[PDB]
């Protein structure tokens, strides 16, 4: 991961993706708030989509800043919860940036 | 634009630059976090009723125009 005092030897050079790697970690309360909001919004959309109702009202509520910042945090440090009941991860390629989370629950 | 400011220092790879009041532009450090840091941004500027017929007539005789559904 990003280790300052390696890149800053130069005032005229910075490695690809340095910003997102060396960026300030998200405050716990904002990571949890945004995660709860994004999971709720997307789960509500998935539900609507299943019934054949492409609900745009739920979609418009997605804030790309929140998700992009979560990408920065899960690439920074991936998170989990637990038979782990949560698992999230961020990926950063030069052509695309992605976030992949998974919340599982067990009945048995 | 992001291309011209990147071209001011291509070796920064779209990472923010820092302009001192002297005038020299250098590659930006994540930890200077000042306003003089070019190419960064605080927030993203993104951009993605049943009416009865009697109620309709009543709500149309008042505003004398034809189209009442804004």
């Amino acid at each position: 991961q990003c280790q300052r005092e390696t890149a800053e030897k130069n005032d005229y050079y910075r490695v690809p993706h340095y910003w997102d790697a060396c960026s300030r970690a998200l405050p716990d309360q904002t990571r949890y708030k945004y995660v709860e909001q994004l999971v709720d919004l997307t789960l509500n959309y998935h539900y609507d989509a299943s019934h054949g109702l492409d609900n745009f009202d739920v979609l418009k509520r997605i804030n790309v800043t929140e998700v992009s910042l979560l990408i920065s945090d899960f690439r920074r440090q991936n998170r989990r919860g637990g038979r782990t009941t949560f698992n999230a991860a961020g990926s950063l390629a030069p052509h695309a940036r992605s976030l992949e989370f998974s919340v599982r629950l067990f009945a048995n | 634009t992001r291309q011209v400011v990147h071209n001011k220092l291509t070796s920064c790879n779209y990472n923010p630059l820092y302009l001192e009041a002297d005038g020299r532009i250098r590659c930006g450090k994540v930890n200077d976090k000042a306003q003089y840091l070019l190419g960064a941004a605080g927030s993203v500027p993104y951009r993605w009723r049943i009416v009865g017929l009697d109620q309709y007539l009543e709500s149309v005789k008042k505003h004398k125009r034809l189209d009442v559904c804004r």
Partner: antibody
Amino acid sequence: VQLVQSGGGLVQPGGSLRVSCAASGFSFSDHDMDWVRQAPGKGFEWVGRSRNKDYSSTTEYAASVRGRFTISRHTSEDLLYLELNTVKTEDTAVYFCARGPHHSDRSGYYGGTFDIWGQGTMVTVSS
Amino acid sequence: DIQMTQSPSSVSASVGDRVIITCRASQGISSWLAWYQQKPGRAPRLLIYDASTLESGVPSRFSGRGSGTEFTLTINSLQPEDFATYYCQQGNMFPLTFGGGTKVEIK
């Protein structure tokens, strides 16, 4: 604004020692608190930082002490702790607790300078 | 990790004398440098922060300049209270590194 220290003293080689400090005149939770040490006749060395109540990873140390020292806070009594477990001979020094930047200051997460120090506590390692 | 070069190593001056003290960082730190004063037997006191900001309660005679690998801190009107040790601190990245200390003594 005031800062009062406690702990310190002698400690048998490979032993443990607690230095703590209490903060008054400011909101101890709303400020990050670092520890700085002075060896007799030498320069200052940074020991670590405790974050400003908004972080889950709440401790940072210098590489030499990263594996031996623990920084903590009280659950609710507004106290700062620095426990030097298995202290070494080269850790003998006077330890001061200091206050860092406010949580609304951008610089504090990644660095900063200090502004207030406590009176200090002498930690002597000897047999 | 960041080496600190302070000059001069030891200095002597009289009351009313001008002293200028330099501190050098191994790699460039923009402005995250501070200057502290340690009276013998006392705890340190912050004198200047953000490289150039004079801390309230400190005499207004101090003024800070410099950047990158060389910074300077003047002491224009030495006052009888100005006998002490002045130290530079780097705040750009962890670990913070300090100077060897600059001893200001009366002449």
